[PDB]
Design a protein around this ligand. Structure first.
Ligand SMILES: O=C(O)c1ccc(O)c2ncccc12
Ligand SMILES: [Mn+2]
Ligand SMILES: [Zn+2]
Length: 477
């Protein structure tokens, strides 16, 4: 166990001395979208079968190799067949009828869409296949969406596209409204649980809605979730409640640069836009597509960075959340997309700096590659904080001890939405109002070169950070 990182004292001494030798190369290669993977795949390998686990007994679910099979980078997606039945999960707790009985006034975000044929997406005139996926936002209650979902089923029983409505992003975070639902999910094995010691998102220290909390989706046939990677490339878990089936389309992480280019050529934003890929385009470009059906009770594991899009075939509900395996692969993909998001001016829903410092306090990391990635992160941010701190003092500006409360979330810049760690810039008016509306350093200087209109709040004792950094060391196996 040879340590390759400077001590916190050494970092601090190097930040004071403004001649000397360097600690590290501050410059760093900026992120970019990858080129199409090498080696390329021939046409006969562009429709690969889906990695599948066939569960029969509760015991099968707790088999340790299941974990490694799902996180294997070579498996972009895994369908765990018969999960609900092997664990005797009561999916009825998530039926529309049960949900209405429990919280009939609960909010539902509604996406109004066009009912498209099979795997295709046509412009609204039925004239040509396009990538843009019309999906307009409104809001309703569980009671009113339940009513639509049920009558929709009745019209079909009886006997230029039809408009449909998709009930999405239903917040199941409140354990006093959903106690029975959330308790049922504690029956799952650790590696897919919402909360776990082995789940990086359980170390964020606060709620990230829909990632470390459960979301529900209420669907009618044709309800589409457009193409996306998960927030900061975290893995995802999804269970179909039924009674109908869902159809999944999946592209390996390695190809997201190719899909980003398809989005740009089609005048769409990869990260933030609404797009449904044309499968003939993907085929022509040698992009492999995993396509499969998720039945009621089947669990779908979306591996880190997997590009995917989904549509209901029948009437069904789904539940979903994110997990973060404690692996070098997952941490690396999360930090890369954290960096890419900054370049793109897209908010990182997972505050990777805040989270890395929490990981360093709480987790004994025994894998060298993961450990080095985390400590490198601590080093870069520790150095950034002490460098900023020095420049402020040397400029006469004062640093107000602000501290932070139990579970205080990470703060972001109200202008560019970057994470702002440790040193917060707020205007004097937002200071007194205790709206504490945070800016990053760059956005503050844009409105006040000398920071006259700004106070600087400090969240952590530098000595606290220096100690967490020095006590984060490679754990024994
Ligand atoms: O509609 C779904 O079942 C779904 C499946 C997989 C996902 O990653 C989602 N992300 C956001 C909203 C819905 C979904
Ligand atoms: Mn998703
Ligand atoms: Zn900013």
């Amino acid at each position: 166990s040879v340590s390759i990182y400077p001590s916190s004292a050494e970092v601090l001494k190097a930040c004071r001395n403004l001649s000397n030798s360097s600690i590290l190369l501050d410059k760093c290669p900026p992120p970019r979208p990858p080129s199409s993977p090498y080696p390329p795949l021939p046409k006969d390998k562009l429709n690969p079968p889906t990695p599948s686990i066939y569960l029969e007994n509760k015991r099968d679910a707790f088999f340790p190799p299941l974990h490694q099979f799902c996180t294997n980078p070579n498996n972009p997606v895994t369908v765990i067949r018969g999960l609900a039945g092997a664990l005797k999960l009561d999916l009825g707790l998530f039926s529309t009828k049960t949900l209405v009985e429990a919280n009939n006034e609960h909010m539902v975000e509604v996406r109004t869409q066009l009912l498209q044929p099979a795997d295709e997406n046509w412009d609204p005139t039925g004239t040509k296949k396009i990538w843009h996926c019309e999906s307009n936002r409104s809001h309703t209650t569980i009671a009113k969406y339940a009513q639509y979902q049920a009558s929709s089923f009745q019209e079909s029983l009886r006997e230029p596209f039809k408009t449909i409505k998709f009930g999405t992003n239903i917040d199941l975070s409140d354990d006093k409204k959903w106690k029975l639902q959330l308790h049922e999910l504690t029956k799952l094995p650790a590696f897919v649980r919402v909360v776990s010691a082995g789940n990086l998102l359980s170390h964020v220290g606060h709620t990230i809605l829909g990632m470390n909390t459960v979301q529900l989706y209420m669907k009618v046939p044709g309800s589409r979730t457009p193409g996306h990677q998960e927030n900061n490339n975290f893995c995802s878990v999804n269970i179909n409640i039924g009674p109908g089936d869902c159809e999944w389309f999946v592209v390996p992480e390695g190809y997201w640069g190719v899909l980003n280019d398809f989005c740009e050529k089609n005048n769409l934003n990869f990260l933030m836009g609404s797009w449904w890929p044309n499968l003939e385009d993907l085929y022509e470009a040698n992009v492999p597509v995993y396509r499969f059906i998720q039945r009621p009770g089947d669990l779908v594991w979306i591996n880190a960075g997997t590009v995917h899009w989904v549509q209901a075939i029948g009437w069904c509900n789904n539940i979903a959340w994110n997990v973060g395996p404690l692996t070098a692969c997952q941490y690396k993909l999360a930090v890369e997309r954290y960096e890419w998001n900054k370049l793109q001016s897209v908010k990182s829903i997972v505050p990777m700096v805040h989270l890395s410092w929490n990981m360093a306090r709480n987790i004994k990391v025994s894998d060298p590659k993961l450990f080095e990635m985390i400590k490198y992160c601590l080093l870069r941010t520790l150095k950034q904080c002490q460098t900023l701190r020095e420049a402020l003092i040397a400029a006469g500006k004062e640093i107000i001890w602000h501290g932070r409360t139990k579970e205080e979330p990470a703060h972001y810049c109200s202008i560019c939405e970057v994470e702002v760690f440790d040193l917060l810039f707020v205007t004097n008016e937002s200071n007194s109002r205790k709206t504490y509306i945070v800016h990053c350093q760059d956005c503050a200087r844009k409105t006040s070169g000398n920071l006259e209109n700004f106070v600087v709040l400090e969240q952590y004792k530098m000595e606290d950070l220096m100690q967490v950094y020095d006590q984060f060391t490679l754990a024994p196996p």
